[PDB]
Design a protein around this ligand. Structure first.
Ligand SMILES: [Zn+2]
Ligand SMILES: [Zn+2]
Lengths: 96, 81, 156, 85, 84, 96
């Protein structure tokens, strides 16, 4: 039910499995060998992306689960200028 | 409740539903263009909007403003949008 | 299919999909006004089913979606507009790409009906938001991103 | 019926789904008074699942719910549930 | 319920008037001028496959189109109608 | 529908909670997803201990306060209750 994401800089992120299945690459990572079917952690070690981009993509996962199709006054997503051009690569790598 | 049935009346998400001049729907032609069949003016039928969220046919709004500059529903001055 | 896979273009970069999409496509004054009225959702559905490049852009940079949201008769033939927007989104056209003037199709919707329909059919993604924010912040993206994503920054 | 099966999460609404969908333009049936009947909470998750399904398959189509033609099966949990109603 | 039965008759009584209003407009657009009595025979001719219009129904519907500034009696004679 | 970002050292947990709900089941769900005994949890709201009886929506952060775009940064501490030592995420590289 809960999946674990580890950033390259040691930082861990835990979010709902439904929240992290909105990205195709993470869905592939959970599938396949080493699924670690303990149903509690399913940890994945992102060896490249830093901590802040992983925090931002977890925020995005929750943001898309909450507002997938509802509340047509959709809130804007606060991309910082410094975190941009690095979250784009992360989103591409995760196929969000 | 083990099982339940219902009916759902679906209609298009347009905020306006009827043109209260000819009392017709907006999807089909206005009475101005229903008279001379297809011809050439049937293709236009531009749905003019109003500042008071009042949407009617172009022909209906044209003849209405020819009569008076009052909204057909409320005593509001007509304006385009 | 044979005609699409040569990609014909008019003077203003209009691909063959765009002319079926556009309302400004000239129609002969004779009986062709009665039958072939553009835009026509049947033509767009057939062309996308025959493999038209739905992401193709003209000289001005407008996509098929950019042209179709600029339709000035959203309700007189609302079924046509709804069917063509559904077909365009289902084909894989980006609902977020930008023309040469850097305008969202929602920003170029110029109509409440088209805006509502496209927002209903917009399928948001993190990549789209990130690329749009990068373009708005005007960060130097060349030689710092994947080359396939360089195109993504190009149209988003 | 297969959409709830094709969902990424197993959503067991608990009510068999047989809801008709009918065009508002053609059918003469409608609702003149308010009759603002609130959805029962045991099936209020069903309509939200149906609104989720209907919006993506049929964009730009609101669904007013005419409850005066709407009927279901009775859960007599207070009666000890004899037979069905 | 017989109370709702009259409502259905009254509802189509609204529909028959709206069709007559469009029926008057259809003939008047193709002519822009006609005799008052000849139009009554014409609207009947175009409504045989549909609702049979009583004579009083055309009376009020023509009157309705008069105040909607679409039809008007001609200045030459009140028996001559004209698009406006 | 309030959103939380529970932090503890290098571990970050994203969780959605209701408007009026006590932190008792919040401690129980973080127990269930953290595989540690439930008696150690003591969450802090900006270096301040929070009342267990008080619902988290009334604890200081509301639905408008804790947007899903960037939820609250409610920390987490374990029994020796240890002092909070949450590691901040690495700053993004400065744009040229
Ligand atoms: Zn009208
Ligand atoms: Zn008005």
């Amino acid at each position: 039910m809960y999946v674990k994401l580890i950033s390259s800089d040691g930082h861990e992120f835990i979010v709902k499995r439904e929240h992290a299945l909105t990205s195709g690459t993470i869905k592939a990572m959970l599938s396949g060998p080493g699924q670690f079917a303990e149903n509690e952690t399913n940890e994945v070690n992102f060896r490249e992306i830093p901590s802040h981009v992983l925090s931002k993509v977890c925020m995005y996962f929750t943001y898309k689960v909450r507002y997938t199709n509802s509340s047509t006054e959709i809130p804007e997503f606060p991309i910082a200028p410094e975190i941009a051009l690095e979250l784009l690569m992360a989103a591409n790598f995760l196929d969000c | 409740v083990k099982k339940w049935n219902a009916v759902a009346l679906w209609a298009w998400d347009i905020v306006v539903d009827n043109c209260a001049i000819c009392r017709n729907h907006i999807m089909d032609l206005c009475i101005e263009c229903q008279a001379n069949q297809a011809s050439a003016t049937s293709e236009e039928c531009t749905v003019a909007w109003g500042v008071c969220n009042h949407a009617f046919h172009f022909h209906c709004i044209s003849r209405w403003l020819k009569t008076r500059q009052v909204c057909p529903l409320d005593n509001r001055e007509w304006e385009f949008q | 299919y044979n005609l699409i896979h040569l990609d014909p273009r008019t003077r203003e970069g209009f691909t063959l999909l765009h002319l079926a999409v556009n309302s400004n496509t000239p129609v002969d004054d004779f009986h062709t006004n009665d039958v072939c009225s553009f835009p026509n959702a049947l033509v767009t559905k057939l062309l996308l089913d025959c493999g038209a490049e739905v992401n193709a852009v003209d000289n001005e940079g407008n996509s098929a979606l950019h042209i179709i949201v600029q339709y000035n008769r959203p309700i007189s033939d609302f079924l046509t507009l709804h069917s063509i927007i559904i077909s365009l989104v289902e084909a894989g056209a980006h609902t977020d790409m930008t023309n040469k003037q850097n305008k969202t199709p929602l920003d170029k919707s110029t109509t409440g009906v088209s805006e509502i329909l496209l927002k209903t059919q917009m399928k948001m993604s993190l990549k789209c938001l990130a690329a749009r924010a990068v373009r708005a912040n005007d960060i130097n993206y060349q030689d710092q991103i994947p080359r396939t994503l360089e195109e993504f920054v190009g149209f988003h | 019926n297969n959409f709830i099966k094709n969902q990424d999460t197993v959503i067991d609404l608990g009510i068999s789904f047989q809801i008709y969908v009918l065009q508002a333009g053609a059918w003469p049936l409608t609702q003149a008074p308010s009759s603002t009947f609130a959805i029962p909470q045991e099936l209020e998750k069903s309509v939200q699942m149906f609104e989720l399904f209907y919006s993506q398959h049929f964009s730009g189509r609101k669904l007013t719910w005419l409850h005066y033609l709407c009927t279901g099966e009775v859960k007599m949990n207070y009666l000890g549930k004899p037979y069905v109603a | 319920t017989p109370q709702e039965m009259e409502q259905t008759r009254s509802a189509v009584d609204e529909d028959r008037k709206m069709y007559l209003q469009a029926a008057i407009v259809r003939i008047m657009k193709a002519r822009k001028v006609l005799r008052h009595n000849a139009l009554i025979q014409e609207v009947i001719s175009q409504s045989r496959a549909r609702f049979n219009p009583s004579i009083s129904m055309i009376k009020k519907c023509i009157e309705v189109l008069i105040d909607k500034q679409y039809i008007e009696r001609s200045q030459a004679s009140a028996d001559e109608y004209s698009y406006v | 529908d309030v959103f939380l970002m529970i932090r503890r050292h290098k571990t970050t947990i994203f969780t959605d909670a209701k408007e009026s709900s006590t932190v008792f089941e919040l401690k129980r769900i973080v127990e269930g997803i953290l595989k540690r005994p439930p008696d150690e949890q003591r969450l802090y709201k900006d270096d301040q201990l929070l009342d267990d009886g008080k619902t988290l929506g009334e604890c200081g952060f509301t639905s408008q306060t804790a947007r899903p775009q960037a939820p609250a940064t409610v920390g987490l501490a374990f029994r020796a209750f240890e002092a909070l030592c949450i590691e901040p995420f690495s700053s993004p590289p400065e744009l040229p």
